[PDB]
Amino acid sequence: MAEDGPQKQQLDMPLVLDQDLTKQMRLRVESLKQRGEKKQDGEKLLRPAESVYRLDFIQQQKLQFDHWNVVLDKPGKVTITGTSQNWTPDLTNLMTRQLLDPAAIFWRKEDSDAMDWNEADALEFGERLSDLAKIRKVMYFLITFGEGVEPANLKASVVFNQL
Q: Do 64 and 160 touch, CB atoms closer than 8 A?
A: yes
Q: Which residues contact 141 (CB under 8 A, 6 or more apart)?
A: 52, 53, 80, 81, 82, 83, 89
Q: What CA–CA distances, in Å, run from 98 to 31, 69, 83, 95?
A: 40, 27, 10, 8
H helix or E strand, kind and range, residue 26: helix 19-33
CA distance 137 to 133: 8
In the chain, where are the structural domains located?
1-163
Does domain 1-163 sit in CATH 3.30.230.10? no
Q: Obtained via which technique?
A: NMR
CA distance 137 to 160: 18
CA distance 109 to 87: 30
Return the closest-CA partner of residue 155 out of 55, 63, 70, 62.
Answer: 70
Q: Which amino acid is at 102?
A: P
